[PDB]
Design goal:
monomer; 629 residues; alpha+beta; Glycosyltransferase; Endo-1,4-beta-glucanase f, domain 2; Endo-1,4-beta-glucanase f, domain 3; 3 domains; four-stranded antiparallel β-sheet; binds a molecule of 8 linked components (SGC-BGC-SGC-BGC-SGC-BGC-SGC-BGC); binds calcium ion; binds chloride ion; cellulose degradation; Endoglucanase F; Dockerin_1_rpt; glycosidase; EC 3.2.1.4
């Protein structure tokens, strides 16, 4: 039987769970897939409220796992995995073996440069630039008997709002789509949504392919998917807890553990440089593992021909601390129940755990917050690293890895999402490296939490950075990085971040015994429950300062390129964000949003983000278990 839990916080979790699963609240589609948010007019990472992401699916797993802990019923957890495998992990029909089996581990893909402005795309493929060797593909095909990859594609058009349908039929749902393709300056507002399965049926003469890639020949019909490593790692994290809590009650989630383990085996593709170039010596093609940084990079992607047989796979050269997950690495490298079937699966994850913890430490600022990350490909073209730039195993430090509109590390959220995982590791193992990191980080954040007399509160929202960490010397260790400073630009009341923060402080307090962290975690949970609860969970009114981009953001389209979206919207030079998403004008909130912009005001919204609601629910559960009295 499981240990007794705090009755008050357990009830709060159950209440949230009921609101989230309540059919009348609309968090899920008819097919059982959770939406990014109840509200449809939503632009953040995705550009429509009813698309879904792998991040959401992993939070759904975490939620159901906790429900199993308190109810003894894990059928919901197994169902979250069933929905994931059926709809977010490309099936045999979505990534045909005929093409995947033609993959050449000695020539994974063809080099394509990255540019700092979307106007430079399409990017020209260059067969003469070196590409390294993929050392794990043989391990995976031998272990699983297939050339298909088992990982979640990151974004899904749940109700086929864009109209691409499934495998170009234009009518089926859900629909595999993608957005980002053109460099660090292409924000959510500057993309051209495209189908993952491109048969040239929609868009331009050759679909949407020649908007991004340029080659000598004619663009072939092809499919392509992109993984979000932090999402897949969270799936492993959540499944571990589901397994632990299931066994404490004589229950089993064996089938799900097997899927989580397989996913973690394939997740190793994120450990490699985009084009398998040697880490620290980007101009040279890798010979195998010398191209592995062992960190959870921003993505790994793969694709292949539809009407011709060929395939490719790429890792990623850019690393952000926010995507790391030391807990998942500990699970996959030490727990016998989660040991990957591949020959080197567990050992690679063992190396990743150590490398990840060094990464966090190297990036810890003088104050305690964690800095951006590093890259093995300067400017995304393997250019020379500017002299005087600090390095980590040969990779140059970057303040805002991967994207700059806005800066990828200017949002407080990355701090809690990532440190929450370090707190789980510290709690389970008491690891000294995790302790050192948390003691200083927790001291920093506890001094940045502000509680008001009316029961409301504020935490860091937008942050900025100055300087850089000292070059990492494995034998020297943490120098203290006296020249690396974080700056809190402004505060806010982001309920999702606050929930993640409470979670982090709870695990840390439980292990360290730090009372300051424990009471702050409880005050956050109480404040949110007592002051921000509504019939659908929790929420607050927030300003949407970037919404002016709905109408004033021009979308770049190559000269002479013309095409049409499924609903007829014309794609040509000069269009704005709204011009290629005209269906948005039918949204219930549209007139309200436009009215505000016309009056020169900042639009405001009351949003119910699925991950935020789940975060809050899980945080209540965690407190209930670690502090029963
Ligand atoms: O036919 C002739 C011949 O053929 C051959 S076979 C041959 C084929 O023909 C050929 O087509 C094929 O070509 C291959 C090629 O080989 C491969 O090398 C390439 S690889 C390619 C890959 O496919 C593609 O997917 C990849 O895309 C990358 C981009 O490069 C990269 O730039 C971006 S970065 C992006 C991030 O990913 C996003 O997450 C991020 O999003 C941000 C957003 O920017 C930001 O605004 C918001 S801010 C937001 C916060 O999120 C929120 O929390 C807070 O609360 O609020 C704030 C404020 O709102 O955050 C978002 C994140 O959350 O944005 C950045 C920037 O865009 O990443 C994508 C990943 O997808 O690029 C790769 C290349 O660079 O693929 C080709 C396929 O076409 O090659 C074949 C051979 O190899 C045959 O053999 C012959 O016979 C035949 O004759
Ligand atoms: Ca931009
Ligand atoms: Ca700076
Ligand atoms: Cl969001």
């Amino acid at each position: 039987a499981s240990s007794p839990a705090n009755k008050v916080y357990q009830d709060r979790f159950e209440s949230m769970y009921s609101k989230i699963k309540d059919p009348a609240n609309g968090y899920f589609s008819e097919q059982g897939i959770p939406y990014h948010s109840i509200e449809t007019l939503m632009v953040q990472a995705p550009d429509y409220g009813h698309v879904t992401t792998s991040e959401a699916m992993s939070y759904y797993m975490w939620l159901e796992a906790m429900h199993g802990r308190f109810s003894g019923d894990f059928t919901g957890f197994d169902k979250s995995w069933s929905v994931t495998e059926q709809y977010l992990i490309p099936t045999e029909k979505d990534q045909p073996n005929t093409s995947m089996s033609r993959y050449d581990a000695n020539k994974p893909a063809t080099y394509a440069p990255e540019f700092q402005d979307p106007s430079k795309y399409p990017s020209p493929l260059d067969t003469s630039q070196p590409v390294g060797r993929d050392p794990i593909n043989s391990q995976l095909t031998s272990a699983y008997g297939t050339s298909m990859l088992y990982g979640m594609h990151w974004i899904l058009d749940v109700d086929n709002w864009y109209g691409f349908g499934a495998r170009a039929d234009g009518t089926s749902k859900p629909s595999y789509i993608n957005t980002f393709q053109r460099g660090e300056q292409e924000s959510t507002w500057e993309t051209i949504p495209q189908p993952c399965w491109d048969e040239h049926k929609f868009g331009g003469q050759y679909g949407f392919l020649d908007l991004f890639t340029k080659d000598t020949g004619t663009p072939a019909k092809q499919f392509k998917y992109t993984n979000a490593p932090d999402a897949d790692a969270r799936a492993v994290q959540a499944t571990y807890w589901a397994d632990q809590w299931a066994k404490e009650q004589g229950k089993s989630v064996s089938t799900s553990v097997g899927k989580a383990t397989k996913m973690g085996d394939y997740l190793r593709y994120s450990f490699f440089d985009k084009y398998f170039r040697k880490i620290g010596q980007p101009s040279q093609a890798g010979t195998g593992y010398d191209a592995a940084h062992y960190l959870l990079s921003w993505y790994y992607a793969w694709g292949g021909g539809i009407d011709s047989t060929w395939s490719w796979i790429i890792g990623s050269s850019h690393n952000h601390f926010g995507y790391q997950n030391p807990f998942a690495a500990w699970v996959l490298s030490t727990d016998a129940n989660f040991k990957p079937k591949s020959s080197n699966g567990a050992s690679d994850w063992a190396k990743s755990l150590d490398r990840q913890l060094e990464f966090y430490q190297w990036l810890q600022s003088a104050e305690g917050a964690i800095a951006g990350g590093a890259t093995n490909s300067w400017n995304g073209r393997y250019e020379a690293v500017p002299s005087g730039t600090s390095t980590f195993y040969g990779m140059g430090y970057v303040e805002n890895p991967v994207y700059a509109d806005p800066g990828s590390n200017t949002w407080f959220g990355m701090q809690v999402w990532s440190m929450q995982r370090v707190a789980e590791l510290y709690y389970k193992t008491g690891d000294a490296r995790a302790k050192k990191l948390l003691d200083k980080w927790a001291k920093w954040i506890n001094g940045e939490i502000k509680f008001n007399a009316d029961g409301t509160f504020q935490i860091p929202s937008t942050i900025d950075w100055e300087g850089q960490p000292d070059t990492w010397n494995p034998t020297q260790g943490y120098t203290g990085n006296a020249n690396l400073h974080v700056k809190v630009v402004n505060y806010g009341t982001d309920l999702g971040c606050a929930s993640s923060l409470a979670n982090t402080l709870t695990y840390y307090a439980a292990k360290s015994g730090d009372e300051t962290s424990r009471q702050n975690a409880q005050k956050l949970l109480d404040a949110m429950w007592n002051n921000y609860s509504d019939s659908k969970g929790i929420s607050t009114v927030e300003q949407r300062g970037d919404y002016h981009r709905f109408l004033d953001q021009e979308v770049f389209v190559p000269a002479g390129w013309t095409g049409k979206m499924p609903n007829g919207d014309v794609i040509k030079s000069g269009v704005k964000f709204i011009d290629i998403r005209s269906k948005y004008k039918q949204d219930p909130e549209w007139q309200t949003m436009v009215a505000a912009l016309q009056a020169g005001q900042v639009p405001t919204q009351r949003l119910h983000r699925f991950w935020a609601q789940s975060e809050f629910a899980v945080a209540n559960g965690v407190y209930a278990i670690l502090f029963p009295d």
